[PDB]
Amino acid sequence: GDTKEQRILRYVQQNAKPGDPQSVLEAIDTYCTQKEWAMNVGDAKGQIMDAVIREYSPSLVLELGAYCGYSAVRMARLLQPGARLLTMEINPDCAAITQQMLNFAGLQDKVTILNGASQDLIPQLKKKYDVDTLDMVFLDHWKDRYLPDTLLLEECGLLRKGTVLLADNVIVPGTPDFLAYVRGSSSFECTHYSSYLEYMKVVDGLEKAIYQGPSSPDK
Numbered sequence: 001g002d003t004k005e006q007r008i009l010r011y012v013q014q015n016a017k018p019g020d021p022q023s024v025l026e027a028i029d030t031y032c033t034q035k036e037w038a039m040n041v042g043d044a045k046g047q048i049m050d051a052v053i054r055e056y057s058p059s060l061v062l063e064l065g066a067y068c069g070y071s072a073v074r075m076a077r078l079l080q081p082g083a084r085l086l087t088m089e090i091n092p093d094c095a096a097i098t099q100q101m102l103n104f105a106g107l108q109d110k111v112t113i114l115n116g117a118s119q120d121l122i123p124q125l126k127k128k129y130d131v132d133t134l135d136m137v138f139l140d141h142w143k144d145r146y147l148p149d150t151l152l153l154e155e156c157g158l159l160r161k162g163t164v165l166l167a168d169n170v171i172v173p174g175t176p177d178f179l180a181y182v183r184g185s186s187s188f189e190c191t192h193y194s195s196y197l198e199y200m201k202v203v204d205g206l207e208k209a210i211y212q213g214p215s216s217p218d219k
């Protein structure tokens with residue numbers, strides 16, 4: 001039967017233009033703001049994402065929580081030739097939607113979709129997906145997983161000095177354990193990007209946390 005995620009994809013395929021990532025973003029934002037609410041980063045936070053991507057021009061990006069592919073389209077469209085997005089999506093049907101979304105956008109060659117749980121896939125990146133270290137991580141999956149997966153990324157050797165973590169929804173509904181950790185730790189240099197959720201009429205924010213390297217042992 002029909003699902004909201006199938007409806008988002010159908011709306012894009014009807015109204016956007018194939019090979020035009022920007023029209024795809026605009027169709028999804030129009031849909032989610034005019035037709036039917038959906039978990040969506042939205043254009044305002046999307047601008048912040050764009051600016052981070054443009055500032056750091058990452059060659060290898062890991063996304064946690066693709067959902068329908070909005071953020072994957074958002075980020076992958078700004079990646080250079082040879083740059084890669086790896087995106088993880090725990091739900092098989094959403095992973096399928098994300099693939100079709102990216103196919104329509106013409107971005108399928110820049111993205112690898114991994115269908116599984118973050119804590120299961122993250123430790124396979126080095127072996128199976130030929131990853132050394134990540135240049136950027138976008139966290140937008142389950143909120144209680146931001147802190148443990150960040151710790152996991154670190155202990156797996158996937159962060160290097162200068163790796164940018166960018167996490168959504170750290171205020172609403174909030175990830176206070178993640179924030180307390182990264183802001184307090186000398187291993188992360190943190191900044192906060194406030195953005196309004198107009199539909200909920202509440203301020204939310206993204207946290208940017210730049211990995212500084214592991215903590216030094218006592219002398």
Ligand SMILES: COc1ccc([C@H](C)c2cc(-c3cn(C)nc3C)[nH]n2)cc1
Nearest residue numbers: 065066067088089090116117118141142
């Ligand atoms: C109501 O159930 C859900 C609510 C939101 C989602 C988002 C789209 C999501 C979360 C993840 C995910 C979770 N882990 C531990 N690792 C990964 C990868 N992938 N995508 C999925 C299910």
Ligand code: NA
Nearest residue numbers: 041140168169
């Ligand atoms: Na989000």
Ligand code: NA
Nearest residue numbers: 182183185188
């Ligand atoms: Na810090």
